[PDB]
Amino acid sequence: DLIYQDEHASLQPLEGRTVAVIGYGIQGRAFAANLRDSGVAVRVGNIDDRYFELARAEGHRVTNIAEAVAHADIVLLLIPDEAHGAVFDVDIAPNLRDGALLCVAHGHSLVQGDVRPLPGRDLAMLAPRMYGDPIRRYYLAGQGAPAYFDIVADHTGRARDRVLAIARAVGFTRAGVMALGYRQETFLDLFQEQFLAPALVDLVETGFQVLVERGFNPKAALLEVYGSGEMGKMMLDGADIGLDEVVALQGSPTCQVGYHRWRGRTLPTAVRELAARVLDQIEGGDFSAYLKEQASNDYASLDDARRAALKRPLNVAHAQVRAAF
Amino acid sequence: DLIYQDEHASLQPLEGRTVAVIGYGIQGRAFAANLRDSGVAVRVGNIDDRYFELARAEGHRVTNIAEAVAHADIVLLLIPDEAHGAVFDVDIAPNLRDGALLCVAHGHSLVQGDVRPLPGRDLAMLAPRMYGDPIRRYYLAGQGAPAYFDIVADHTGRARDRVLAIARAVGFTRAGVMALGYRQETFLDLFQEQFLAPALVDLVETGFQVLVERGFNPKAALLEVYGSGEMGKMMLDGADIGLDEVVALQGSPTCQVGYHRWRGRTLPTAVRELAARVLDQIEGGDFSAYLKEQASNDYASLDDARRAALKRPLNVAHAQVRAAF
Ligand SMILES: Nc1ncnc2c1ncn2[C@@H]1O[C@H](COP(=O)(O)OP(=O)(O)O)[C@@H](O)[C@H]1O
Ligand SMILES: Nc1ncnc2c1ncn2[C@@H]1O[C@H](COP(=O)(O)OP(=O)(O)O)[C@@H](O)[C@H]1O
């Protein structure tokens, strides 16, 4: 495994170079803010909207995307993946200076083919593992977000040092920056969204329903299941020292005994089989198909699931809790 | 439902009264710090150890437990439940001033019979839903922790106002303080520890194993499954606006579509049946039995599960990650 930190990365490759940040959302504003604080010359490329006005008002050298790319050596494409293909073809590819570098913040856009290698220019992924605002927090708190990187096209032979110079300027090198293919990163993102995320909430919901069906106070049921933030905190503390280690160091004897009675025995094999069924759907291409179909409806059936979800006892109870507290 | 806030509670019942905080751990130090900042006269009762020295060094009027109870009108018993029975019988019950109030921070000690009603004195539960340090943070941040309360013995007719005066002084009334029996609170605590907590980690682990078994980078697998804190953050953000609502407001279309494809369909009935099997074990008394047996070994078999857990691929991978980052 190949993991770079502050000692293995240098700010030298950015000296006298202009970085263009495309977008000024939760991702864009964080990168832009850190780069500037690290002494990197940063321009903001953005469309005529509210986000553009914010960048100008916060002192950044802000123009339309095309202008920003023309006046830049490293370009950071930090807008939604839905916009990449169009912006890439019209703004980026035509104006990208000879020997310049293009970076995306995950592999979604590269796997889709919306962003592609260009003869005479470098292309990379530099994907923080924390989305948006934390990147700004961690940085100002002397820390940084862990990140993956992949050199897609190294037509200069300078991509790696420049990629890691950005990674360092933004703070990612402090935690550490590991090498991993954009394709695998994309499949981990989708897997977290399609198996893990739903399965946590389904489980949380199952606990709520069983308590309510057994005549426990619904507001209290929801509060303990996740409403407290206690389940939230455990999973954040777990990321530091380990999930079992949280129970050992923080938990009481009555808690530890009870936890360990059911640890490794709550799930039938059926769960494992679905985790593989979900991966099949991502690697095989069955999801890539599913998604295109939703987008053709204008995400009509998605907006039904949005509204269907809020009718569920859990989301009914949540509204009743927030109102009361 | 009966939920009290700042407007429905008063600091008047604490004016010219002395509050004794038994213990100075993560719970004790937080209560003590807030009470003092709210202008309440607070004494600290503690045994001859490191925790006692900390209280004295931070300016608190600190003595042995028995002395603190004798010189107090409201007593807060904020030490481990293992110590309650002994401290109660020797220190509290013999010295508890006529018409004084005893409070515990959950129902564990009351259900066990270690803390009991006394003729001529008040007894209550005031249980914050966030354990330890957050109580201090939330307070200094102008906020407070949600809490449950139960009046066990109201021999004065003044218990409720004094309980809620403490609740307000500590900050719990800001969020809100709901009425709930100590017995139910105990069963929610144990249920969170025995079904939900294990089932989250089992699920997290299942995701990790499936990814590793399919030739994904183990360090990356663990990072995405919980190591990021992204799953942690979602469940904390979920407590604010709702778990499905987090996906709707923060998630991308590709994320939302994928999440909603598997939401409500990841778990077979077997899961629901165990959630009931776990409740049976807590209400029926089968767990109360299980626990006593572990304590007779001196928690020998628990220390085996502690060490067994750290051998699991997930906890092996966690060590490899933290070291690397
Ligand atoms: N279709 C589009 N074409 C170009 N830029 C866009 C488009 N849609 C949104 N943007 C820009 O992308 C940013 C949106 O950020 P946001 O929606 O918060 O997502 P993210 O977190 O991925 O940045 C803004 O700068 C906005 O102006
Ligand atoms: N057997 C005991 N008898 C009396 N006090 C005890 C005993 N064990 C621990 N304590 C006290 O209880 C506190 C322990 O706090 P800690 O272990 O962090 O748990 P908690 O979060 O429940 O307070 C300290 O003040 C300690 O001195």
XYZ file of C-alpha atoms and ligand atoms in Angstrom:
704
model
C 0.000 0.000 0.000
C 1.199 3.550 -0.957
C 0.156 6.293 1.596
C 1.691 9.850 1.386
C 1.782 12.338 4.350
C 3.074 15.964 4.856
C 6.744 14.699 4.914
C 6.316 12.846 1.517
C 4.550 15.858 -0.195
C 5.823 19.427 -1.021
C 4.122 22.844 -1.709
C 7.000 23.668 -4.190
C 5.142 22.416 -7.340
C 2.389 25.104 -6.720
C 4.844 28.092 -6.334
C 4.073 30.728 -9.049
C 1.190 28.502 -10.370
C -2.560 29.441 -10.547
C -5.173 26.867 -9.282
C -8.723 27.252 -10.772
C -11.586 25.940 -8.524
C -14.676 25.182 -10.735
C -17.756 25.460 -8.431
C -18.228 27.237 -5.040
C -20.678 24.849 -3.258
C -19.882 22.917 -0.017
C -16.923 21.140 -1.804
C -15.673 24.148 -3.869
C -15.751 26.774 -1.038
C -13.746 24.449 1.332
C -10.926 23.713 -1.225
C -10.811 27.434 -2.278
C -10.597 28.587 1.413
C -7.763 26.103 2.344
C -5.680 26.715 -0.878
C -5.824 30.532 -0.219
C -4.838 30.068 3.502
C -1.914 27.786 2.339
C -0.646 30.719 0.160
C -1.686 29.100 -3.204
C -2.852 31.573 -5.936
C -6.505 30.393 -6.496
C -9.123 31.556 -9.090
C -12.864 30.573 -8.899
C -14.699 29.545 -12.123
C -18.537 29.496 -11.738
C -21.821 30.122 -13.696
C -23.996 33.291 -13.241
C -25.823 32.359 -9.943
C -25.880 32.928 -6.098
C -22.672 30.797 -5.600
C -20.691 33.165 -7.946
C -21.809 36.250 -5.885
C -20.612 34.522 -2.623
C -17.070 33.862 -4.050
C -16.725 37.547 -5.200
C -18.052 38.789 -1.780
C -15.421 36.589 0.054
C -12.547 38.191 -1.963
C -11.822 35.376 -4.527
C -10.757 36.209 -8.156
C -14.045 34.902 -9.713
C -15.010 34.581 -13.459
C -17.014 32.221 -15.777
C -15.580 28.623 -15.931
C -13.954 29.044 -19.428
C -11.994 32.209 -18.321
C -10.793 30.459 -15.085
C -9.458 27.372 -17.033
C -7.637 29.602 -19.625
C -5.871 31.444 -16.692
C -4.997 28.242 -14.696
C -2.261 25.523 -14.517
C -4.213 23.106 -12.187
C -8.072 22.900 -12.570
C -10.237 21.406 -9.725
C -13.694 20.326 -11.100
C -15.822 20.488 -7.861
C -19.430 20.750 -9.241
C -22.101 17.969 -9.438
C -21.266 14.978 -11.764
C -24.478 15.823 -13.784
C -22.693 19.030 -15.048
C -19.160 17.541 -15.731
C -19.732 16.157 -19.299
C -21.167 19.500 -20.599
C -18.677 21.816 -18.729
C -15.767 19.470 -19.754
C -16.654 19.513 -23.520
C -17.537 23.287 -23.746
C -15.374 25.045 -21.052
C -12.468 22.742 -19.943
C -11.170 20.677 -22.953
C -11.104 23.687 -25.380
C -9.328 26.097 -22.903
C -7.108 23.719 -20.780
C -3.534 25.213 -21.063
C -0.791 22.918 -22.544
C 0.723 20.706 -19.759
C -2.058 21.667 -17.244
C -3.744 19.272 -14.708
C -7.490 18.385 -14.309
C -8.687 16.834 -10.959
C -12.115 15.358 -9.954
C -13.057 14.544 -6.283
C -14.305 10.954 -7.063
C -14.391 8.404 -9.949
C -18.159 8.720 -10.829
C -17.384 11.229 -13.674
C -14.363 9.200 -15.025
C -16.199 5.777 -15.085
C -19.161 7.540 -16.873
C -16.662 8.846 -19.527
C -17.868 12.481 -18.968
C -14.225 13.469 -18.086
C -11.498 11.897 -20.347
C -7.701 12.091 -20.913
C -6.491 14.931 -23.257
C -3.242 14.695 -25.316
C -0.597 16.931 -23.603
C -2.497 17.441 -20.267
C -2.596 15.517 -16.914
C -5.783 13.963 -15.350
C -6.149 12.681 -11.717
C -8.682 11.843 -8.949
C -8.094 13.443 -5.479
C -11.118 12.261 -3.408
C -11.438 13.334 0.274
C -13.267 10.689 2.438
C -15.244 13.493 4.225
C -17.717 15.445 1.977
C -17.733 19.278 2.083
C -17.548 21.409 5.269
C -15.420 19.083 7.513
C -12.496 19.601 5.003
C -12.580 23.330 6.067
C -12.996 22.501 9.838
C -10.236 19.782 10.014
C -7.836 22.215 8.172
C -8.439 25.225 10.550
C -8.163 22.725 13.508
C -4.553 21.904 12.361
C -5.761 18.484 10.985
C -7.039 17.299 7.535
C -9.375 14.773 5.793
C -8.052 11.366 4.603
C -8.118 11.189 0.737
C -7.590 8.675 -2.132
C -5.766 9.685 -5.374
C -5.299 8.079 -8.848
C -3.109 9.400 -11.746
C -5.353 8.659 -14.821
C -3.097 10.385 -17.448
C 0.538 11.436 -16.615
C 1.425 13.063 -20.017
C 3.784 15.588 -18.236
C 5.562 13.204 -15.783
C 4.824 15.883 -13.082
C 1.163 14.906 -12.215
C 1.911 13.010 -8.926
C 3.900 15.865 -7.223
C 1.315 18.541 -8.308
C -1.678 16.313 -7.218
C 0.012 15.769 -3.769
C 0.974 19.515 -3.596
C -2.817 20.313 -3.867
C -3.556 17.411 -1.409
C -1.064 19.052 1.060
C -2.250 22.692 0.447
C -5.857 21.487 1.239
C -4.667 19.448 4.309
C -5.343 15.816 3.149
C -1.616 14.800 3.576
C -1.823 15.479 7.394
C -4.209 12.471 7.844
C -2.637 10.647 4.828
C -3.378 10.166 1.064
C -3.536 6.517 -0.243
C -3.356 5.335 -3.920
C -6.604 3.656 -5.207
C -8.127 3.355 -8.744
C -10.978 5.854 -9.487
C -13.131 2.833 -10.608
C -12.870 1.036 -7.177
C -13.457 4.366 -5.286
C -16.723 4.800 -7.338
C -17.867 1.215 -6.413
C -17.129 1.823 -2.656
C -19.161 5.122 -2.792
C -22.140 3.362 -4.524
C -21.871 0.301 -2.145
C -22.007 2.608 0.965
C -25.129 4.309 -0.582
C -26.926 1.093 -1.799
C -26.269 -1.636 0.890
C -24.855 -0.067 4.111
C -26.854 3.242 4.291
C -30.328 1.645 3.697
C -29.475 -1.364 5.970
C -28.528 0.930 8.958
C -31.869 2.880 8.680
C -33.913 -0.371 8.105
C -32.232 -1.777 11.295
C -32.794 1.532 13.231
C -36.465 1.417 11.994
C -36.870 -2.319 12.998
C -35.774 -1.393 16.583
C -38.285 1.546 16.615
C -41.273 -0.542 15.296
C -40.617 -3.454 17.775
C -40.463 -0.964 20.742
C -43.671 0.894 19.568
C -45.464 -2.480 18.876
C -44.520 -3.471 22.519
C -46.097 -0.248 23.960
C -42.907 1.870 24.492
C -43.246 5.719 24.216
C -42.812 6.499 20.453
C -40.908 9.827 21.076
C -38.534 7.964 23.505
C -38.255 4.903 21.157
C -37.067 7.181 18.261
C -34.801 9.272 20.609
C -32.861 6.152 21.848
C -32.716 4.457 18.368
C -30.907 7.506 16.756
C -32.661 10.784 17.885
C -30.220 11.115 20.877
C -27.165 11.165 18.545
C -25.775 8.474 20.950
C -25.814 5.809 18.140
C -24.330 8.569 15.900
C -21.543 9.403 18.450
C -20.652 5.672 18.991
C -20.088 5.257 15.185
C -17.941 8.485 15.117
C -15.939 7.431 18.262
C -15.781 3.927 16.633
C -13.915 5.442 13.604
C -11.168 6.599 16.086
C -10.524 3.509 18.327
C -12.770 0.746 16.788
C -16.497 -0.095 17.340
C -15.945 -3.057 19.782
C -13.206 -0.929 21.502
C -15.789 1.903 22.124
C -17.979 -0.625 24.095
C -14.879 -1.902 26.039
C -13.501 1.582 27.035
C -16.748 3.686 27.377
C -19.406 1.004 28.209
C -20.466 -0.199 31.724
C -20.259 -3.928 32.695
C -24.087 -4.384 32.225
C -23.627 -2.706 28.756
C -20.498 -4.755 27.740
C -22.018 -8.132 28.897
C -25.272 -7.378 26.955
C -23.467 -6.113 23.775
C -21.169 -9.215 23.615
C -24.152 -11.640 24.138
C -25.515 -10.716 20.627
C -22.343 -9.437 18.788
C -21.773 -11.586 15.630
C -25.202 -13.373 15.910
C -27.870 -10.691 14.962
C -27.853 -11.336 11.142
C -28.812 -14.443 9.101
C -26.671 -15.326 5.979
C -29.422 -13.629 3.816
C -27.763 -10.221 4.690
C -24.265 -11.268 3.366
C -25.930 -12.584 0.118
C -27.596 -9.142 -0.530
C -24.229 -7.307 0.036
C -22.920 -9.522 -2.867
C -26.218 -9.037 -4.859
C -25.675 -5.202 -4.505
C -21.996 -5.488 -5.714
C -23.148 -7.682 -8.699
C -25.606 -4.830 -9.603
C -22.700 -2.243 -9.549
C -19.918 -4.339 -11.262
C -22.263 -6.336 -13.606
C -23.881 -3.033 -14.783
C -27.510 -3.697 -13.593
C -27.453 -0.451 -11.450
C -25.919 1.681 -14.298
C -29.105 0.562 -16.191
C -31.497 1.198 -13.199
C -30.143 4.808 -12.827
C -30.475 5.825 -16.561
C -34.189 4.710 -16.390
C -34.917 6.988 -13.325
C -33.194 9.994 -15.056
C -35.459 9.509 -18.180
C -38.591 9.985 -15.934
C -36.844 13.219 -14.680
C -36.383 11.247 -11.367
C -40.241 11.016 -11.067
C -40.315 7.634 -9.176
C -37.498 8.975 -6.870
C -39.766 11.911 -5.750
C -42.458 9.246 -4.914
C -39.935 7.374 -2.637
C -38.967 10.792 -1.069
C -42.670 11.449 -0.145
C -43.425 7.724 0.643
C -40.494 7.693 3.172
C -41.904 10.678 5.203
C -45.225 8.733 5.748
C -43.327 5.879 7.578
C -43.941 5.709 11.387
C -40.215 6.594 12.041
C -40.361 9.892 10.013
C -43.855 10.671 11.515
C -42.332 10.182 15.038
C -39.217 12.287 14.070
C -41.455 15.314 13.184
C -43.338 14.829 16.531
C -39.947 14.771 18.433
C -38.225 17.846 16.794
C -41.474 19.887 17.349
C -41.604 18.829 21.064
C -37.823 19.579 21.561
C -47.057 13.461 26.719
C -45.586 15.840 29.391
C -42.435 17.778 28.192
C -41.039 20.732 30.285
C -38.759 23.509 28.843
C -37.002 26.653 30.296
C -40.389 28.546 30.420
C -42.081 25.691 32.455
C -39.111 25.355 34.941
C -37.650 27.855 37.523
C -34.233 28.251 39.313
C -36.129 29.606 42.424
C -36.371 26.194 44.226
C -32.479 26.038 44.338
C -31.990 29.587 45.843
C -30.166 29.289 49.234
C -30.018 25.442 48.799
C -26.829 23.258 48.615
C -26.585 20.570 45.828
C -24.186 17.628 46.578
C -22.689 15.906 43.454
C -21.551 12.328 44.410
C -18.781 11.362 41.907
C -16.527 13.543 39.661
C -16.160 11.304 36.541
C -17.402 12.247 33.014
C -21.034 12.529 34.368
C -20.202 14.145 37.771
C -17.737 16.820 36.472
C -20.258 17.999 33.771
C -23.222 18.415 36.236
C -20.908 20.086 38.848
C -19.501 22.536 36.199
C -22.992 23.560 34.846
C -24.643 23.909 38.346
C -21.739 26.222 39.460
C -21.985 28.328 36.214
C -25.820 28.587 36.792
C -25.076 30.122 40.263
C -26.179 26.983 42.251
C -24.202 26.310 45.503
C -22.640 22.845 44.720
C -20.558 20.491 46.970
C -18.646 17.413 45.604
C -18.762 14.108 47.575
C -16.091 11.567 46.441
C -13.800 8.736 47.761
C -10.000 9.175 48.349
C -8.733 8.863 44.691
C -7.517 10.867 41.591
C -11.105 12.155 40.849
C -11.279 13.800 44.356
C -7.936 15.655 43.724
C -9.305 17.002 40.351
C -12.481 18.474 42.013
C -10.371 20.242 44.740
C -7.901 21.540 42.055
C -10.871 22.986 40.004
C -12.126 24.980 43.060
C -15.112 22.773 44.171
C -15.992 22.349 47.918
C -14.971 18.622 48.020
C -15.294 16.084 50.939
C -16.043 12.329 51.488
C -19.575 11.268 50.294
C -21.102 11.066 53.855
C -20.004 14.693 54.712
C -21.397 16.017 51.354
C -24.866 14.364 51.930
C -25.077 15.710 55.557
C -24.403 19.287 54.191
C -26.839 19.020 51.192
C -30.580 19.509 50.367
C -30.464 17.849 46.859
C -28.043 14.861 46.317
C -27.030 13.796 42.732
C -25.697 10.158 42.742
C -23.471 10.215 39.567
C -21.095 7.214 40.155
C -21.253 3.712 38.535
C -24.390 1.592 39.382
C -22.009 -1.097 40.869
C -21.242 1.364 43.772
C -24.842 2.704 44.412
C -26.141 -0.068 46.778
C -23.082 0.197 49.122
C -22.787 4.065 49.041
C -26.629 4.341 49.466
C -26.754 2.050 52.583
C -23.553 3.423 54.297
C -23.258 7.124 53.183
C -26.636 8.380 51.771
C -29.580 6.789 53.723
C -28.009 7.414 57.201
C -27.037 11.108 56.490
C -29.791 12.298 54.023
C -31.251 15.501 55.665
C -35.036 15.482 56.477
C -37.057 16.568 53.365
C -33.971 16.285 51.047
C -33.979 14.916 47.423
C -31.954 11.982 45.917
C -31.542 11.790 42.063
C -30.024 9.023 39.831
C -29.206 9.563 36.081
C -31.023 6.347 34.892
C -33.333 3.574 36.239
C -30.710 0.716 36.384
C -30.060 1.371 40.144
C -33.823 1.752 41.018
C -34.974 -1.458 39.160
C -32.074 -3.358 40.909
C -33.408 -2.078 44.310
C -29.923 -0.654 45.215
C -31.548 2.841 45.629
C -34.974 2.861 47.441
C -37.553 5.373 48.790
C -36.868 6.741 52.351
C -39.675 7.959 54.694
C -39.574 11.821 54.745
C -37.241 12.275 51.688
C -37.841 12.645 47.886
C -36.430 10.255 45.181
C -36.341 10.922 41.370
C -34.633 9.929 38.072
C -33.212 12.788 35.891
C -31.550 10.946 32.946
C -29.833 12.973 30.161
C -29.995 11.199 26.719
C -26.316 12.174 26.025
C -23.712 10.515 28.357
C -20.995 12.677 29.985
C -18.985 15.422 28.210
C -21.616 16.631 25.642
C -23.765 17.836 28.650
C -20.881 20.324 29.385
C -20.413 21.268 25.648
C -24.170 21.772 24.831
C -24.484 23.973 28.013
C -21.482 26.291 27.176
C -22.822 26.427 23.534
C -26.102 27.983 24.893
C -27.948 24.621 24.308
C -28.600 21.518 26.518
C -29.122 17.698 26.424
C -32.653 16.199 26.195
C -33.515 14.316 29.466
C -36.218 12.001 30.938
C -37.416 12.380 34.582
C -39.564 10.254 36.976
C -40.726 11.217 40.535
C -40.330 7.852 42.422
C -41.199 9.208 45.940
C -42.784 12.710 46.425
C -42.941 12.703 50.296
C -42.428 16.557 50.359
C -44.818 17.582 47.513
C -41.890 19.766 46.219
C -39.890 17.051 44.284
C -41.065 18.002 40.722
C -40.083 21.744 40.926
C -36.659 20.931 42.550
C -35.949 18.090 39.994
C -36.789 20.522 37.091
C -34.790 23.351 38.820
C -31.690 21.019 38.647
C -32.718 19.996 35.054
C -32.776 23.761 34.149
C -29.539 24.675 36.079
C -27.753 21.837 34.118
C -29.373 22.920 30.771
C -31.688 19.910 30.010
C -34.865 22.148 29.937
C -33.475 24.096 26.878
C -33.856 20.960 24.651
C -36.820 19.692 26.773
C -37.411 17.214 29.681
C -40.122 14.491 29.145
C -41.818 12.309 31.849
C -41.029 8.524 31.556
C -40.914 5.701 34.189
C -37.361 4.757 35.382
C -38.229 1.070 34.562
C -38.971 1.798 30.823
C -35.855 4.085 30.556
C -33.731 1.116 31.875
C -35.269 -1.257 29.227
C -34.588 1.286 26.381
C -30.915 1.632 27.571
C -30.458 -2.208 27.683
C -32.304 -2.648 24.292
C -29.965 -0.065 22.597
C -26.950 -2.003 24.075
C -28.217 -5.592 23.323
C -30.033 -5.437 19.890
C -29.251 -2.128 18.080
C -25.528 -1.611 19.006
C -24.388 -5.195 18.101
C -26.618 -5.246 14.944
C -25.056 -1.967 13.568
C -21.459 -3.349 14.010
C -22.452 -6.841 12.634
C -23.941 -5.010 9.567
C -20.848 -2.697 9.257
C -18.665 -5.888 9.539
C -20.800 -7.792 6.903
C -20.176 -4.899 4.423
C -16.393 -5.012 5.208
C -16.075 -8.856 4.812
C -18.062 -8.896 1.479
C -15.822 -6.073 0.048
C -12.563 -7.817 1.256
C -13.837 -11.255 -0.023
C -14.440 -9.505 -3.446
C -10.812 -8.174 -3.571
C -11.406 -4.526 -2.435
C -8.535 -2.752 -0.532
C -9.048 -3.708 3.180
C -7.896 -0.249 4.520
C -10.334 1.472 2.050
C -13.144 -1.086 2.772
C -12.948 -0.293 6.557
C -12.561 3.508 5.913
C -15.823 3.692 3.825
C -17.813 1.290 6.120
C -17.244 3.522 9.259
C -13.520 4.621 9.397
C -14.354 7.859 7.437
C -16.883 8.977 10.106
C -19.232 9.539 7.085
C -21.640 6.769 8.324
C -21.178 8.332 11.814
C -21.986 11.892 10.536
C -25.098 10.690 8.567
C -26.546 9.142 11.806
C -25.770 12.406 13.751
C -27.242 14.637 10.947
C -30.132 12.071 10.821
C -30.963 12.856 14.514
C -31.532 16.537 13.431
C -33.682 16.281 10.223
C -34.391 12.484 9.864
C -32.315 9.657 8.251
C -34.272 9.498 4.907
C -34.310 13.370 4.922
C -30.432 13.412 5.132
C -30.303 11.363 1.836
C -32.927 13.698 0.199
C -31.230 17.044 1.178
C -27.464 16.093 1.169
C -27.353 13.117 -1.299
C -26.758 13.288 -5.112
C -29.313 11.802 -7.592
C -27.106 8.657 -8.164
C -26.949 8.351 -4.298
C -30.732 8.948 -3.701
C -31.821 6.531 -6.534
C -29.458 3.797 -5.165
C -30.453 4.333 -1.464
C -34.230 4.149 -2.255
C -33.779 0.951 -4.404
C -32.909 -1.070 -1.210
C -34.559 1.033 1.608
C -37.093 -1.180 3.503
C -35.939 -4.446 1.761
C -32.427 -5.252 3.252
C -33.663 -7.316 6.289
C -35.595 -10.629 6.473
C -38.311 -11.024 9.225
C -35.677 -12.981 11.313
C -34.251 -9.536 12.421
C -37.647 -8.263 13.811
C -38.086 -11.619 15.707
C -34.666 -11.168 17.481
C -35.573 -7.538 18.496
C -38.608 -9.156 20.291
C -36.414 -12.091 21.574
C -34.029 -9.424 23.100
C -36.993 -7.551 24.768
C -38.345 -10.917 26.145
C -34.848 -11.463 27.716
C -35.016 -7.968 29.421
C -38.735 -7.955 30.531
C -39.002 -11.758 31.198
C -35.820 -11.588 33.380
C -33.558 -13.961 31.311
C -30.892 -11.157 30.918
C -31.026 -10.181 34.666
C -30.011 -13.884 35.164
C -27.322 -13.860 32.362
C -25.647 -10.742 33.936
C -25.463 -12.090 37.574
C -23.666 -15.231 36.173
C -20.952 -13.099 34.383
C -20.378 -11.004 37.589
C -19.799 -14.263 39.631
C -16.866 -15.182 37.256
C -15.545 -11.601 37.973
C -16.570 -10.882 34.298
C -14.029 -13.576 33.152
C -15.963 -14.654 29.971
C -16.487 -10.901 29.139
C -12.651 -10.357 29.025
C -12.504 -13.344 26.555
C -15.081 -11.592 24.243
C -13.034 -8.313 24.611
C -9.851 -10.125 23.354
C -11.782 -12.366 20.840
C -13.299 -9.194 19.220
C -9.832 -7.612 18.510
C -8.809 -10.771 16.488
C -11.737 -10.202 13.997
C -10.664 -9.013 10.483
C -12.463 -5.620 11.066
C -10.465 -4.804 14.284
C -7.223 -6.143 12.620
C -7.895 -3.764 9.644
C -8.750 -0.851 12.063
C -5.278 -1.137 13.743
C -3.651 -1.219 10.232
C -5.629 1.978 9.237
C -4.986 4.153 12.394
C -1.221 3.259 12.172
C -1.120 4.252 8.438
C -3.083 7.539 9.109
N -25.613 22.646 -14.424
C -24.593 23.272 -13.846
N -23.583 23.722 -14.622
C -22.558 24.349 -14.035
N -22.361 24.615 -12.748
C -23.376 24.156 -12.001
C -24.496 23.494 -12.460
N -25.333 23.171 -11.404
C -24.714 23.634 -10.348
N -23.522 24.243 -10.638
C -22.601 24.853 -9.688
O -22.079 23.837 -8.863
C -22.143 24.235 -7.472
C -23.210 23.417 -6.791
O -22.717 22.934 -5.523
P -23.681 21.966 -4.694
O -24.986 21.855 -5.402
O -23.678 22.376 -3.261
O -22.906 20.574 -4.843
P -21.385 20.147 -4.541
O -21.335 19.822 -3.074
O -21.098 18.952 -5.407
O -20.546 21.339 -4.899
C -22.390 25.745 -7.516
O -21.175 26.458 -7.686
C -23.255 25.877 -8.769
O -23.217 27.175 -9.319
N -16.584 1.606 44.264
C -16.727 2.927 44.249
N -17.261 3.535 45.332
C -17.405 4.865 45.310
N -17.093 5.728 44.350
C -16.568 5.099 43.288
C -16.358 3.742 43.163
N -15.797 3.452 41.930
C -15.683 4.616 41.345
N -16.132 5.658 42.112
C -16.142 7.068 41.747
O -17.044 7.241 40.677
C -16.440 8.043 39.634
C -16.145 7.148 38.458
O -16.563 7.795 37.237
P -16.413 6.957 35.886
O -15.740 5.663 36.187
O -15.838 7.830 34.823
O -17.948 6.660 35.546
P -19.228 7.623 35.399
O -19.192 8.139 33.987
O -20.436 6.773 35.673
O -19.040 8.711 36.417
C -15.223 8.687 40.301
O -15.590 9.858 41.016
C -14.792 7.592 41.275
O -14.020 8.092 42.345
